[model samples]
Target chain A: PADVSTFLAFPSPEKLLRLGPKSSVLIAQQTDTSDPEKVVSAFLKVSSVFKDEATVRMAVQDAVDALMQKAFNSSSFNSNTFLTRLLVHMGLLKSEDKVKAIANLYGPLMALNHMVQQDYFPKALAPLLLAFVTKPNSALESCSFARHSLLQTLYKV
Target chain B: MSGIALSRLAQERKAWRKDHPFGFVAVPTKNPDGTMNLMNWECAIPGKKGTPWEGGLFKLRMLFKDDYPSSPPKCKFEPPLFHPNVYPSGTVCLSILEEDKDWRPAITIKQILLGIQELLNEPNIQSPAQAEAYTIYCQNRVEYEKRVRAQAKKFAP
Candidate 1:
């Protein structure tokens, strides 16, 4: 009976470590199917449960990649809000990983111009803008339009 | 992540959903999860009364950024509308939508759509975003009217 109970127990630490990224993808898929509000809530839930830093970061990146793919293929898939939440989570990841996450945020940042509330713009502005401004090698050319606009806004502010 | 932007969008949706202008409909597109993507909206504008576009429904896609009221949302015609102020990429060229120009944070969705509705018949010759529409509109009023009428009929509801 003890052995049977053990067999039916929740995933062990080792198993969870192995399944971390995979579980993230599953949750991301679940997010894609849930309401927008639920998508953010579910992502936050996953963020809180996954304790390993590397595993959590990997999961976040994979989830973002999945969201980007869906948005690119389907015009109906509005990944803007989901992407925003993911970026916020990415901010908590390792510093090296944070750079890439901030860089990728450019697209969403530009796309946010059309959004009504603009709460994320203010919150994510500095890091997001800094990523583009400092990385002149790639971001300068890639995010020229947004950079110039940001410069103007910063100057105004 | 701040939900302020989403709440503002919800407020706009509530107001617009309860009442909108006759012959004009603006609806936020739904995601796969059945949640409204407030940042992206699909709109249908009926042709102006007594114009060549009369009785025809013009379709448009409005992509809003998070900085929505701060920066105007992009209003682009679907199917690359033949209009003087509509770009080859379907982007509408209007002063109000321009960030450095007449863009004011107080402008409402109803105002933007109405502006587009007005732009239907009264295309701005000052800033022509398309060559064909402008050329024909200037050189031959009859031909321009004929083409517009044809387009109107094709898109008529």
Candidate 2:
């Protein structure tokens, strides 16, 4: 019941909290916003829901897996728009919104998804996670679990 | 906490969401509860075309005090831009963001971002914020542009 119900739903901080200590399951759900920073903000909250380092690692893993799945999907908005912003933050793609998307755009878009999905994104996100923890004033900053797990997941991916 | 600051920021958020310049980024920070953080933002500014900074989308952070509008939002670039007017800490030095001189309550975030975008190419040499960029920019114009172009590749989408 929970699977079907929440599967169709996007995650909110409130809703994720409603799942309480067991909310790690919801970490794999869709995000309410497409903005990477907001998603990272929500993600920083993962350390709050579960007290154990294990759950924190589990929650982060789910979040990354979900991101990979969503990004791989062949669709616009949910795929193109969201993936574009994420890649921009990771420095994998350049965004020029004024430049009209046509054949010129397709080359970069296809190349990004093709090769990056193959290797670059996961590896890129590893150092990004470690560095990102320092910038935001977040619980994740103090959580050694998340920090340690950052490097671990890169190899796993 | 200031009523004036909160209200104006709320209005600014809605207005920004309604429309922003193409090739620019401006998004508010989100809380663990999924509520918006009006005081903080995650933003980016695309390098202007035909400039050495072109094809780059630079990451930025905006932090506002409770006395915002009356004061000024502090802006910083992540990965610090190699510019004469940008500090090594990534904080920007521009007229509009300065509370003492040019910052006005009337200056919107869009204006602020565009101003910083312009500063990327047109730095104020008289007010150099960092030594490396300032010296290279003045003493070796060719080397300065070379450094900027190389840095742009790092910031590229």
Candidate 3:
């Protein structure tokens, strides 16, 4: 703190004369903790630099904004099945897992995203479950045994 | 804004508050995420001015990257600024906060606010808001300066 304070309060005799307030500000900035002072210096420097170099500054600014947007938008789960299967695979989801169940579709994100892209899975899970439940004896002939097993688990357990 | 880990943005702002406790307050706006958003912010209406933006306590936002301190934030006017350098959408054409080779992680919010202050006084010379503010400033530099100076009166205590 004293080292920082000495630099701030007295400064070397040369810098005090050469830089004046602007240089002092620049030096103070290096050691300054106050947000207002730092921001004020930033604005002053930006004003000077903007007049001299507009294009480069704008480019950097836009890149920062784009990066911020990307960060905010990338954090969601993106799929109901991912959530449901996550629970089911862990034995938490009520749905029974077939040996070759749709959960097999869950692998790398590329595979999952591909499944979503291919439109193979119904867009909505509830309707798919409803359809699977209602027509199990007919259309889903292959899954009849597995569906029965699932129902038994839910009913018994 | 929540799951995205905007703690840097939050912390910088909190730092700002710790520094600028009175007069300037930065209240962030909501995010699409149910989580608290730190992007939108509010300050007490600035003192009025004699310029075209007179009596208009403008609203603005700072969109920042999750990798902040390494990148700059983007500040644009909300409800728009009529200044030649400010876009009709109120985006300030200042260069320091823009993305580019020179934009390093060292820049902070306090600097950004200062940039805004300097921009208020100087506005860019070469680039104008599609050339209108540019033209007004270039063709009638004296008149423009006088007008803006008169407007600045409302900002003072």
Candidate 4:
């Protein structure tokens, strides 16, 4: 079945067509190389804002649900990698390659999962493994390779 | 007409996918019915830890609605982090991409990418991944930078 949430997050063909030739091309390129880490990281921060797991989960799920509703025209890519990345980064997935694959599959979803786990609750048992994924001062912040076009839109948005 | 239109979009997407055979990008997989499914891709910078990003070259994904520019894209990180603005799932709350924030009509792909890059250096102070980062930033700037740098060197590319 088509992912309702993923479908909603992406613009429809008609809507994308109406975005103007320049916008269409730009948006397409953006979708192709878009990095979902920003959203994932943001979700984590937002989850931290609250103290309740239900609230955190709800917020995270809502955000994910909302994003999945949209579907960029890209056919080869899914949102699984977001969750895989989170699992791998968080020590959930073992294969490094699989971790990357998940990022490609549902990158945003994994990101959302990571956010909820890190923000809403703090646990000692999960810390050891989770540290790799949620470690402070880790590189998730320092060395990034983002395209210029995306920055322009994001800044203006 | 929509079916034909879908075919054309699919063709364009396939062509683009061909160019990005390798790297952090996700490519689509095939199903039994000869249909393509967007799958996950592993983190791009595997060998080199994402120094600025926290450690791993995490994977990600984003879903764009047909109304893209009009509506903000939802983003998230997999696994989670201790950053200021990121949620556990890796979602971010950077002001530039906020749906209700000073979003402009002229925003483009380049702008969004640039905004994400900038986010790494200066996280939205107003919203942090965890409130602790704010306190940490305020209490010990040097310590924080040192910590960040330490992690960077540990996972330097």
> Whose TM-score is greatest here?
2
The CA lDDT at A151 in model 2 is: 34
Predicted structure 2, TM vs. truth: 0.50
lDDT of 2 at B133: 71
Candidate 2 per-residue lDDT over residues A63-88, each given as its tens digit: 44454444444233233334334433
Could you give candidate 4's per-residue lDDT for residues A66-131 as a string of tens digits?
A: 333222123433334443344444333332133232122122323333433433222322332233
**Candidate 2: count of backbone clashes, pairs at least 3 residues apart or interchain:** 2
- Over A23-112, each residue of candidate 3 has an lDDT whose tens digit, in order, gives 334443453223333322222222222211344334222222232223223344233433334323322223322422222111111112
Query: Who is ahead in lDDT, 2 or 4?
Result: 2
Pairs in steric clash, model 2: A93-B157, A94-B157
The weakest ten consecutive residues by lDDT in model 3 chain A span A104-113
Query: Which ranges in model 2 have alpha carbons more than 4 Å from their true place?
Result: A1-157
Question: How large is the interface RMSD of each prediction?
Answer: 19.6, 12.1, 27.9, 10.7
lDDT of 4 at A112: 36
Highest lDDT scorer: 2
CAPRI-style grade of the A/B interface in model 2: incorrect
DockQ score of the complex predicted as candidate 4 = 0.02
Which stretches in model 3 have alpha-carbon errors above 4 Å? A1-157, B1-5, B32-35, B43-56, B66-70, B145-157
Chain A only: TM-score per candidate = 0.33, 0.35, 0.18, 0.29
Candidate 4, residues B1-157, lDDT tens digits: the string is 2344334435535764565322234334456787763321222222223434554343434434445456554545444444556665566555656677855555533344445545655676544544334445555767666655654455434
For candidate 4, the share of real interface contacts preserved is 0.00
DockQ of each: 0.02, 0.03, 0.01, 0.02
